[PDB]
Design a protein around this ligand. Structure first.
Ligand code: ADP
Ligand code: ADP
Ligand code: ADP
Ligand code: MG
Ligand code: MG
Ligand code: MG
Lengths: 51, 578, 315, 470, 193, 158, 193
C-alpha cells in the first residue's frame, strides 16, 4: 500500500513543482536580459548627444 | 572586388570602412595575416565583419578584402579518402606544411590542384547542355566519377578536350557563350541542391543488424535518431552501419567532439576493411573532424558541408548514408553564436529558430530523381545525447517531431552486457507500413505476420513483470513460465548480436526469417505439449535448445541446410516426447 | 499603371532594411526587392516615418548590398485573387500554383487580413453535424459554424481522426424534416510546417476518397521561408469566407499543427527585439490568434457557413 | 619610449586615450602618473579616435593632467627556460621567491595554437598517483583530462598537494623495463588566500618536491586579469617542456570556479550581454581552449596530463561550470561529504566517480593483468553492501541471510581499509594486494566477474598485513 | 459626484444557491470571479443578468467571443423581466468589443460602461454591472505601454495597472444622489489568469 | 487585520501598578495615515473611532483609492512629522497606524520605473530599503523626555 | 604594511559551545554568519563582543537599527571585562551608521573600522572586528552604480563587488609587526540574503 501510494502520488507532485519553478526562474532571467539590452542601448545613445 | 581598411577592433568584431558594394554574408579576408570572416551588417560606407580566429595583434588601417561569395564547398574529384574540418580544410596537407599545430592564416585548397586525372569525354561539339547532365567520367578508386555541369548553367557546347591526363583546374568543356566548365564547381552550403521529383520510400536500408532492421526498420532515404548515454554502443552501431550497410558512399560528420575521441576515430578507421571488395574502408568514406577548440563557426557549419557533399554524391546516382555524431554539440555552437549576436533566448537558452534549422537539415534526405535522369538517395542518422537522460530537453523534442525512426538506447542492458542495448519498449518506427510490399515479395510471404507474432510474444513477456517482481519466478504456472522462457530465448538468441564475430556481425533477411520461423516452431509445439501435459522442466532441457542458440553462428551460405535440419529435428524431438 | 523604385538603402541588419526617402510608402504595404543578380525578394513595410521606412524581408537577406539593391512598390494592402475555379487546385501558401497548371483568373481581389463580422449580422449556430463517432456525436457534438480544435500529443493519431471526420460528416436533415437536398460541401485544407511523409498520407487519402474535386489545398513545407507560414492560414480563411458568403457553400477548414504557426510567430517577434511573454512567446499572441479563429460562423440572411477544426500538438 | 598624454576619461577600471591608433589590440601598456608610480594595463578596444585600456590594480592617484601611457609589448609573451624547475611566480611571470629572474631561451605567446587532430595518438600508459581509490578503480592515463569535483568544506587542497607530492611513472612495469623518463609537475593556484598559500609553500619545500615543480601562485586580492592569464602561462610552460624536451608533465589547476567568476566580471566590465545564469555565452569555447591543450602527440615522447579541480557552488551538478566541464573532460572524481564527516581521508566515493580512458591503460603489458576484473568486482560488491546497510536499519541484522551479512562486513572493512589510507604512499602492487585481501572475505564462487585463472592464483590471503596496522 | 456614500445592508440576489447562501454580495459591493478556461465565468455572468433583482443591467464584453453577444441579442427579447413582466432586453444595455475588434478600444469600453452605470445610478435605480474580462483590458494597457517604450514592472504589465484597477472598482457603492434619491451600483468582474 | 488594529488601539494600556510607580496614565494620542484605503474599511475605522470616542484625540491623514497615486509619497512623512512634534514637544504618548505599505511601495515603484532606475527583485527599485528606513526609524524614545512614538504598520502579503 | 604573515595556531574563544567545539575559528582567521531576518546574527555578534578573549573589540554598525547601538552604549559600561576586570566599554570602539543615515557613508564606515583595527594590531594586541551587515555595503554600491549609468552584474551590483569584498577580508591575519611584536586581527562578517 505504501509503495503504491508513493509511486502513484508523491513523486509526480514533486516533479510538477520542479517543472513550475524552473519556468519561473527562466522567465525572470529573460526579463533581466531584456532590461540589460535596453540599458546598453541607452548607453550607446548617450555618447552621440554632442559627438 | 571591394577593398577597405579596418576602422575599429573590439574582440572578434571588426568594423571596416570603404566597403561600399560588399554584399551581406560574404566571406572576407581581414588584416595582413589573412584571417577570414563574414559580413553580418551593412551601414553606409562601413561593414561589420565577424572574424573566425584570434584577432590579437591586429591594428587599425590593415586592409580588408572581400571574396564576393558566401560560405561554399568545392565539389569535384578528390574528396574520397580525405579528412576535412568544418570549413573543408584538408588537415593532412596542413600537417605537412605546418607541423603539429594549426597556425592562424594558413591557406590550402580543398581539392589537389596538381594531381592528374584520366579524362574521358562523353559530349560532342554542337550538343546542348542543361544543368545536371554528364560531360564525362573520371576513374577514382572503385568508382567512376561523373563530371557534372553546374545546376545553374545551360548552353550549347563549343569545344571539348580530347582524352588525356589533366588537372582539376584545366577547362574541359567551353560553351558557345564563352563560359568555361572545369572538373569542379562550387555551391553554397546553406542552399539545397535542386532535383526533379522526390519518390516515395519503398526499399529498406539494410543495416545488417538484426533488431534494428527487423523490429524498427528505416527505409532508404529516411531519417533516424539514436539517443543514448555513455557505454551504450552509439559509436559501434554507427561504424557497423558504415561497414555493413548497402550504401555506396558513407559520410561521417563529427561536430566538436572530445580530442581523444576523435583520435580513436581517426586512427581506427583506416584499419577497417570494405566487405564488398576487401580493400580499405577509407576508399569510400569522407570524414569531417572538429574538436572543441576549433572556431565555433566551423563547428556550426560542419553539418551543412557534410549534407552538401552527400547531396553532390547523390546527384551522381549513388546511395549515400550520412552519420551526424552528437547534434547536441552542434546546437551548443548555435547557442554560442546566437549569444554573441545578442539575440533573445527561448526555452533552455537556445535561439528561437533551433527547430527551423533542425527541420531544414533533416528535410534534405530522401530518394529523388536527379537532374541527369537517375535515381539517388541520402539517409541521415543523427546521434543525440541528453544531459541526464531526460528526453524533455528542447533538442530531443525538436528531433522527435520530424524523424521517421527513433532507436532509444539504454545503459541498463549494457550493464548486463546485452548488446545491442536498445530499449524495444520505447523505440518506434514509421516505415513498417510502406515496406512490407517489398518484404513479402523479396524475403518471404509469411515475414510480416511472423514479425507481428514475434512482437506479440515480446509484449506478453513484458506484461508479466509485476508478477515476477513480487512472486518468485519459479512459482509461476506452466503457461506463464513457458512465455517467460520464450521471452528469454528471444532476448538472448535473436535480439543479441556480436559485431566482432566472423559471421554474426552481418545477418541477412533469409537468415533472420529462418531463425524466427525456428523459434515459432519451437513455441507452438511447446504450447501444444503443455495442453498435452508434461513436465515443464523436460521441455526446458530438450536438445533443440542448442539448435536454437547455435543458429546465430552458422554461415550465410550454409544456413538453409541447418534450417531444414532443425525444422525436422524439432518435430522429431517433440514427437519422441511422451 | 506606372511603377516607382527607391534606391536609397542605408542600413541592412538581420531581417530589416531601411529606405531613406520613401515618404510615399503606405503602412503595411507590400514591396518588391531586387538585388544585383536579378533575384527578386518580397517584403512588407512595418514602420514608416519622415526620416526612413522600415521593411522586413520575407526570407533571408543573403546577397543584398547598398550599391545595387532597389525597392519597388507592389500594392498598398496584401490581397489575394480569388475565383470559383480554385476548387481542385494546390497552392504554396503565398498564392502561387504548384500543381503545374496555369494560374487562375481572379474574379475579385480581397484583403487577406479580413474584416470583423458585425455581431448584429451573426446568427446562432443550430444545425447538428453527425460525424459518426460516439464520443463526439453524443457528448461533444459539432454544430455548423463551430470552431472545435483537437488537442493532441506527439505520437497520437490526430490526423487520422481529422480525415475520418472529414469523410463521414453529414447534416441529417431528416431529423428536422428539412428536405432532401444537400447545399454543396467543400473542404479547405491548410498545412503549416508539414513533412513530406505526412503530406503524402493526406494526398493519398483525398485521392482515395475522391474529395479532391471539391477541395482547395494550401501547402507550406518545412524548408519554406518562415514568413510564408504566417500568411498560410489567412489566405485559406479568405478563400473559405469568399466561397461561403458569396456562393452559399458549406466549407470545412482544417488547420494542421498550429504549433508550427506559433513557433514561427515567436521567431518573427523575437527577430525585432520585443518584450516577451510567458515562455518567450510574444505578448500579443491572443489578438493574433483571435484574428484567425473568429472568422468562422454563420451570417443572418445567407445560406453558407464556415466550420473550423484546428489541430495542435500539446508540448 | 613614446608616451601618450591625451587622457580624456577615467571611470572605474577603464580609461580612454586619444590619438592612440598605433596601439595593437590586446597590447600591454604601462600607466604612469605624477607621483612616479607605474601601473599595468591592457588594451581592449582600438578605434580611429581613441583606445580603451583596462587598468590593473586601482586607479586612486590618477588625474587627466599628468597621466601618460607607454607601450610595453604588443603580444603577451612569457620567457621559458629549463631553469624554471624549482621557481615560484606570481601569475604573470614575476618571481616571488627572492631569487634572480631566469634568462629566457625563448619567448612564446601565452595563447596556444590548437593541436592538429591528425597529429594526436591514443593514450596508452598510466600514472601511479599513490591513491588506491584512483589507481585501482579510476586509473589516470597519460594524456587524460580527469577533473576532481568537490564541495565547499571538503579537503581538495590537501588531496592536490598529496597527488603532486606522490605522482610518479612506472617504467619497470612497461614491457621489458624500458628506460628512465623525466617527470615534472606544474602547479597553478588561482584565487587562493594567504593560508592556502602558506600551506602550499610549506608542503612543497618540506619534502623535496620543489626540485621538480614549477609553481604559479595567484592570490585572492590580486588583479583578476592575472587570474585570467595564469593557466595559459602554466600550460605554455608545460607544452614547452613536454614537446621540446620529452618530459612527462602533470598540470594541476587548483580552482576553476575562481576562473569562471573572474571571466564573468571581466565580461561584465566590457559591456557584454551574458548568457545562461549570468555567465558569458563563450564560456564553453574559453574552457575548451584550456582543457584541450593536453594530450600526446605522434612522433613525440613527451605528454601533458591535466587534473583540473573545481568546487561545486551549491552541490548542484547541473550548474554551468560542472556541466560544461563534463562535456570536454574524460570522467570525474567526486569527493563525498558523508565520508569526510565520518573521518575518512581521502573522501573519494567510488560510486559516482568514473574514468573513461581506463580500459586503454590496463591489461597485460602494463600494470597487472587482473586489474580490470578486480575493479569491476569491487565496484559491484560495494554497491551491494551499501544498500544492504540501509536495509539492516529496518529489517534487523538477524533477518538477513549469511551472504547479506558477509556483504555488510565487506562494505565496512572496505570503507575502513581501502579508502581510508591516510597519508600512506601505496604502490599499485600494494593496492592490488589489499583489494584481493578484501575480496577474500567474500566466499569463492560469488566472484562472478573474475575468471577462475586469477582466482586460483590470488584468492585466499588474509587481511593481517594492513589489519595489524590500519 | 455624489452627496454621501452609505454602508450596504441589503443583499444582491443572484438566483444561485451557493452564491446567495454561502458567499453573499451586498447591494453596493464588488466581487471578482477568477477561473481557468471552460470553468463557467460567462454562464454565471449571463445567469446573473437574467435572474438578478437589479433594475438596470449593463453588460460589458471587453475582448471576448462574438457568438455570446449574438446569444444575448437573440435570447433576451423573448425572455421575461422578473420584476416588471416586460421583455428582458428592455432593461439591458450592451457594450460589445470582440476579440478581433481593434485592441485600443478595449480600454474605452470599460469606462463607457461604468459611466452609463453611474448615470443610471443618479436617477435612483439599482444598477448591476458585469465586466466579461479585465485581463483583456490589462493586455491593451500592456500593448500601449510597449508602443510607448516604457519600462515594464512585472510580467510585462505597466507599473500603473493597479491604480487603474483600483480606480475602476471604486466607482461602485450605495450613495445618496445629488437629487436626494438613493441608488447603488454593483460591479462583478471576471479575471482570466 | 483592520479589526485587530482597532481592537489594539481600543484596549491598549500600561500597568504602573505592576512596575510599582503607582501613577495613573493618560490615553494614547492616535495618528492615522491611510494610503489607497477603500470606503468599506474607511467607514469601519471612522465608526469604530466614533463609538470608542477617540476622535477628539486623533489626527487623520486620508488618501483614498480614487485619489491620485503620487500623493502617497508624502503622507507617511507628514504623519510622522506631526507624531514626532507632538511626542517630543508636548510630552504626548503617540500611537501611529499606517494602513497599507503595499500601496506606498507600488507608488514608489511607479516613479522608479518612470526614471529607469536599476531594479531589485520583482521590479522594485534598488533604493526601496533606504526609503522604507526613512519612515520606520522615526519611532522610539528620547533620553530626558516624557513622550514616545509607537508604530503599528499594516501590510498585505501578496 | 607588516613584516611577515604567520600561520594560525591559536583558537579564538567565543564562549558558545557549538562554535568553539564543532566549528572553531583561529586567532587570525575569518568567518561569515549568514541567515534570514530573525535568525540570530546580531545577538551572536554581541555575545562575541561580550565574552570573547580579544584584547580590543571593534564593532561596525553598517546600515542597521539604532536601538542595537543604544543597547551597546547603555549596557556595556555596567559589564565587566573578562580578562582585566574593568568596565567592558573601556576596550570597545563603536562605529555607527544607521539605516536612515546617508547611503554613501556605509562603505566609509567599513574602511574606517578595518583601518582602526589594523592600527590596534600594530601595538601588539589581538583585535576582533565585527561587521553587522556587509550586504548593505553592496546595496549602497548598487545605488551609486544606478546613478553612474554603468553596466550592472547578475543582480544589479557593480562588477567590481567581489574585488572589494576580497580586499576587505584579506586584511585579517596574524602578523609580525614592523616593530617586531606580534598581533592579530580576526574578522566576523554577517550576511543578510
Ligand atoms: N555488437 C556488439 N558486440 C559487442 N560489444 C558491443 C556491441 N555493441 C556495443 N558494444 C559495446 O558497447 C560499448 C560502447 O562502445 P562505444 O559505442 O565505442 O562508446 P559509447 O557507446 O560510449 O559512445 C563498447 O565497450 C562495446 O564493447
Ligand atoms: N451552471 C451551469 N450549468 C450547466 N453548464 C454550465 C454551467 N456553467 C458552465 N457550464 C458549462 O461551461 C461551458 C462553458 O463555460 P464558460 O462560461 O464559457 O466558461 P469561460 O467563459 O471561463 O470559458 C458551457 O458549455 C456550459 O455547458
Ligand atoms: N542565543 C540566543 N538566545 C536567546 N535568544 C536568542 C538567541 N539568538 C537570538 N535570539 C532571539 O532571536 C531574535 C533575533 O533578533 P536579532 O538577532 O536582533 O535579528 P537578526 O538576527 O534578524 O539581525 C532576538 O530577538 C532574540 O530574542
Ligand atoms: Mg560514442
Ligand atoms: Mg467566457
Ligand atoms: Mg540584526
Amino acid at each position: 500500500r505504501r509503495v503504491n501510494a508513493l509511486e502513484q502520488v508523491v513523486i509526480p507532485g514533486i516533479r510538477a513543482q520542479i517543472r513550475f519553478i524552473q519556468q519561473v526562474l527562466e522567465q525572470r532571467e529573460r526579463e533581466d536580459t531584456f532590461r540589460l539590452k535596453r540599458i546598453k542601448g541607452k548607453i550607446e545613445a548617450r555618447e552621440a548627444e554632442e559627438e | 572586388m571591394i577593398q577597405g581598411v579596418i576602422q575599429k577592433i573590439a574582440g572578434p568584431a571588426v568594423i571596416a570602412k570603404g566597403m561600399l558594394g560588399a554584399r551581406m554574408y560574404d566571406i572576407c579576408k581581414v588584416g595582413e595575416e589573412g584571417l577570414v570572416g563574414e559580413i553580418i551588417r551593412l551601414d553606409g560606407d562601413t561593414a561589420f565583419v565577424q572574424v573566425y580566429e584570434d584577432t590579437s595583434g591586429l591594428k587599425v588601417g590593415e586592409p580588408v578584402v572581400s571574396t564576393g561569395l558566401p560560405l561554399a564547398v568545392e565539389l569535384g574529384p578528390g574528396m574520397l579518402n580525405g579528412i576535412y574540418d568544418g570549413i573543408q580544410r584538408p588537415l593532412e596537407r596542413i600537417r605537412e606544411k605546418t607541423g603539429i599545430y594549426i597556425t592562424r592564416g594558413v591557406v590550402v585548397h580543398a581539392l589537389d590542384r596538381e594531381k592528374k586525372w584520366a579524362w574521358t569525354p562523353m559530349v560532342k561539339p554542337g550538343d546542348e547542355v542543361r544543368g545536371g547532365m554528364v560531360l564525362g567520367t573520371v576513374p577514382e578508386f572503385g568508382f567512376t566519377h561523373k563530371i557534372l555541369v553546374p545546376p545553374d548553367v545551360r548552353g550549347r557546347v563549343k569545344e571539348v578536350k580530347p582524352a588525356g591526363e589533366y588537372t582539376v583546374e584545366e577547362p574541359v568543356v567551353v560553351l558557345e557563350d564563352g563560359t568555361e566548365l572545369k572538373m569542379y564547381h562550387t555551391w553554397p552550403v546553406r542552399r539545397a541542391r535542386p532535383v526533379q521529383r522526390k519518390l516515395d520510400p519503398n526499399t529498406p536500408f539494410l543495416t545488417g543488424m538484426r533488431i534494428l532492421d527487423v523490429l524498427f526498420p528505416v527505409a532508404m532515404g529516411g531519417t533516424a535518431a539514436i539517443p543514448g548515454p555513455f557505454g551504450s554502443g552509439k559509436t559501434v552501431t554507427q561504424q557497423s552501419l558504415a561497414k555493413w550497410s548497402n550504401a555506396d558512399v558513407v559520410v561521417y560528420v563529427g561536430c566538436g567532439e572530445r580530442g581523444n575521441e576523435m583520435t580513436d576515430v581517426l586512427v581506427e578507421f583506416p584499419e577497417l576493411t570494405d566487405p564488398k571488395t576487401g580493400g580499405p574502408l577509407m576508399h569510400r568514406t569522407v570524414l569531417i573532424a572538429n574538436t572543441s577548440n576549433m572556431p565555433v563557426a566551423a563547428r556550426e557549419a560542419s553539418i551543412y558541408v557534410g549534407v552538401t557533399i552527400a547531396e553532390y554524391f547523390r546527384d551522381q546516382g549513388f546511395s549515400v548514408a550520412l552519420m551526424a555524431d552528437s547534434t547536441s554539440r552542434w546546437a551548443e555552437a548555435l547557442r554560442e553564436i546566437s549569444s554573441r549576436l545578442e539575440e533573445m533566448p527561448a526555452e533552455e537558452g537556445y535561439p528561437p529558430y533551433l527547430a527551423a534549422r533542425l527541420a531544414a537539415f533533416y528535410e534534405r534526405a530522401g530518394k529523388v530523381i536527379t537532374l541527369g535522369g537517375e535515381e539517388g538517395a541520402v539517409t541521415i542518422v543523427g546521434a543525440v545525447s541528453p544531459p541526464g537522460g531526460d528526453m524533455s530537453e528542447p533538442v530531443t523534442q525538436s528531433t522527435l517531431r520530424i524523424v521517421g525512426a527513433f532507436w532509444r538506447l539504454d545503459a541498463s542492458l549494457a550493464f548486463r552486457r546485452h548488446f545491442p542495448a536498445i530499449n524495444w519498449n520505447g523505440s518506434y518506427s514509421l516505415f513498417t507500413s510502406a515496406l512490407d510490399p517489398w518484404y513479402r515479395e523479396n524475403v518471404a510471404e509469411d515475414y510480416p505476420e511472423l514479425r507481428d507474432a514475434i512482437s506479440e510474444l515480446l509484449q506478453r513477456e513484458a506484461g508479466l513483470q509485476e508478477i515476477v517482481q513480487l512472486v518468485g519466478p519459479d512459482a509461476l504456472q506452466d503457461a506463464e513460465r513457458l512465455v517467460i522462457e520464450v521471452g528469454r530465448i528471444i532476448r538472448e538468441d535473436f535480439l543479441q548480436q556480436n559485431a566482432y564475430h566472423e559471421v554474426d556481425a552481418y545477418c541477412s533477411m533469409k537468415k533472420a526469417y529462418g531463425i524466427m520461423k525456428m523459434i515459432l516452431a519451437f513455441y507452438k509445439e511447446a504450447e501444444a505439449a503443455i495442453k498435452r501435459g508434461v513436465s515443464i522442466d523436460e521441455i526446458l532441457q530438450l536438445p533443440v535448445l542448442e539448435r536454437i542458440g547455435r543458429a546465430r553462428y552458422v554461415s550465410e551460405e550454409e544456413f538453409p541446410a541447418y534450417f531444414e535440419e532443425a525444422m525436422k529435428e524439432i518435430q522429431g524431438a517433440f514427437k519422441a516426447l511422451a | 499603371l506606372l511603377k516607382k523604385e527607391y534606391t536609397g538603402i542605408t542600413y541592412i541588419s538581420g531581417p530589416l532594411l531601411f529606405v531613406e526617402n520613401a515618404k510615399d510608402l503606405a503602412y503595411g504595404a507590400i514591396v518588391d526587392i531586387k538585388d544585383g543578380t536579378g533575384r527578386v525578394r518580397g517584403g512588407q513595410v512595418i514602420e514608416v516615418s519622415e526620416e526612413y521606412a522600415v521593411i522586413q524581408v520575407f526570407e533571408e537577406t543573403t546577397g543584398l548590398d547598398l550599391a545595387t539593391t532597389s525597392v519597388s512598390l507592389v500594392e498598398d494592402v496584401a490581397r489575394l485573387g480569388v475565383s470559383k475555379e480554385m476548387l481542385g487546385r494546390r497552392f504554396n501558401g503565398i498564392g502561387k500554383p504548384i500543381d503545374g497548371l496555369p494560374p487562375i483568373t481572379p474574379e475579385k481581389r480581397l484583403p487577406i487580413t479580413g474584416l470583423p463580422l458585425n455581431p448584429v449580422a451573426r446568427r446562432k449556430p443550430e444545425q447538428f453535424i453527425q460525424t459518426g463517432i460516439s464520443t463526439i456525436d453524443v457528448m461533444n457534438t459539432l454544430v455548423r459554424g463551430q470552431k472545435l480544435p483537437i488537442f493532441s500529443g506527439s505520437g497520437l493519431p490526430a490526423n487520422e481522426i481529422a480525415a475520418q471526420i472529414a469523410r463521414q460528416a453529414t447534416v441529417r436533415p431528416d431529423l428536422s424534416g428539412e428536405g432532401e437536398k444537400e447545399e454543396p460541401f467543400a473542404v479547405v485544407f491548410a498545412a503549416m510546417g508539414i513533412t513530406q511523409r505526412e503530406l503524402s498520407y493526406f494526398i493519398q487519402e483525398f485521392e482515395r476518397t475522391g474529395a479532391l474535386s471539391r477541395s482547395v489545398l494550401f501547402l507550406n513545407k518545412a524548408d519554406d521561408p518562415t514568413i510564408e507560414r504566417i500568411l498560410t492560414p489567412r489566405m485559406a480563411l479568405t478563400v473559405a469566407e469568399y466561397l461561403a458568403f458569396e456562393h452559399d457553400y458549406h466549407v470545412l477548414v482544417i488547420l494542421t499543427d498550429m504549433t508550427n504557426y506559433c513557433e514561427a510567430l515567436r521567431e518573427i517577434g523575437a527577430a525585432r527585439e520585443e518584450i516577451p511573454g510567458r515562455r518567450g512567446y510574444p505578448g500579443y499572441m491572443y489578438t493574433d490568434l483571435a484574428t484567425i479563429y473568429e472568422r468562422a460562423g454563420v451570417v443572418e440572411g445567407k445560406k453558407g457557413s464556415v466550420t473550423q477544426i484546428p489541430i495542435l500538438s500539446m508540448p | 619610449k613614446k608616451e601618450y598624454t591625451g587622457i580624456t576619461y577615467i571611470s572605474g577600471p577603464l580609461l580612454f586615450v586619444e590619438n592612440a591608433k598605433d596601439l595593437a589590440y590586446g597590447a600591454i601598456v604601462d600607466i604612469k602618473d605624477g607621483t612616479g608610480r607605474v601601473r599595468g594595463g591592457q588594451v581592449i578596444e582600438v578605434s580611429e579616435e581613441y583606445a580603451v585600456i583596462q587598468v590593473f590594480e586601482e586607479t586612486t592617484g590618477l588625474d587627466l593632467a599628468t597621466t601618460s601611457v607607454s607601450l610595453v609589448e604588443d603580444v603577451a609573451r612569457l620567457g621559458v627556460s629549463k631553469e624554471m624547475l624549482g621557481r615560484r611566480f606570481n601569475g604573470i611571470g614575476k618571481p616571488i621567491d627572492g631569487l634572480p629572474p631566469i634568462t629566457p631561451e625563448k619567448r612564446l605567446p601565452i595563447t596556444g595554437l590548437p593541436l592538429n587532430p591528425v597529429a594526436r595518438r591514443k593514450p596508452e600508459q598510466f600514472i601511479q598517483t599513490g591513491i588506491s581509490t584512483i589507481d585501482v578503480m579510476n586509473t589516470l592515463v597519460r594524456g587524460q583530462k580527469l577533473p576532481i569535483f568537490s564541495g565547499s568544506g571538503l579537503p581538495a587542497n590537501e588531496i592536490a598537494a598529496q597527488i603532486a607530492r606522490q605522482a610518479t611513472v612506472r617504467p619497470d612495469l612497461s614491457g621489458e623495463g624500458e628506460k628512465e623518463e623525466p617527470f615534472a609537475v606544474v602547479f597553478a593556484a588561482m584565487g587562493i588566500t594567504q593560508r592556502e598559500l602558506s600551506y602550499f609553500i610549506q608542503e612543497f619545500e618540506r619534502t623535496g618536491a620543489l626540485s621538480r615543480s614549477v609553481l604559479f601562485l595567484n592570490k585572492a586580492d590580486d588583479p583578476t586579469i592575472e587570474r585570467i592569464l595564469t593557466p595559459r602561462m602554466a600550460l605554455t610552460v608545460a607544452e614547452y617542456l613536454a614537446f621540446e624536451h620529452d618530459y612527462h608533465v602533470l598540470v594541476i589547476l587548483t580552482d576553476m570556479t575562481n576562473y569562471c567568476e573572474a571571466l564573468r566580471e571581466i565580461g561584465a566590465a566590457r559591456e557584454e550581454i551574458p548568457g545562461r545564469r549570468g555567465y558569458p555565452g563563450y564560456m564553453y569555447t574559453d574552457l575548451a581552449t584550456i582543457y584541450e591543450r593536453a594530450g600526446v602527440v605522434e612522433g613525440k615522447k613527451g605528454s601533458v596530463t591535466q587534473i583540473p579541480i573545481l568546487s561545486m557552488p551549491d552541490d548542484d551538478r547541473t550548474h554551468p561550470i560542472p556541466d560544461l566541464t563534463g562535456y570536454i573532460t574524460e570522467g570525474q572524481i567526486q569527493l563525498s561529504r558523508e565520508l569526510h564527516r565520518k573521518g575518512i581521508y581521502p573522501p573519494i566515493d567510488p560510486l559516482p566517480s568514473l574514468s573513461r580512458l581506463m580500459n586503454n591503460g590496463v591489461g597485460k603489458g602494463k600494470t597487472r593483468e587482473d586489474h580490470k576484473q578486480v575493479s569491476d568486482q569491487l565496484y559491484s560488491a560495494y554497491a551491494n553492501g551499501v544498500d544492504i546497510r540501509k536495509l539492516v536499519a529496518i529489517i534487523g541484522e538477524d533477518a538477513l541471510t549469511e551472504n547479506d551479512r558477509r556483504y555488510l562486513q565487506f562494505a565496512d572493512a572496505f570503507e575502513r581499509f581501502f579508502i581510508n589510507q591516510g597519508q600512506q604512499n601505496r604502490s599499485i602492487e600494494e593496492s592490488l594486494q589489499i583489494a584481493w585481501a578484501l575480496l577474500s572475505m567474500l566466499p569463492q564462487g560469488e566472484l562472478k566477474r573474475i575468471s577462475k585463472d586469477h582466482i586460483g592464483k590470488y584468492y585466499g590471503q588474509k587481511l593481517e598485513e594492513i589489519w595489524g596496522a590500519p
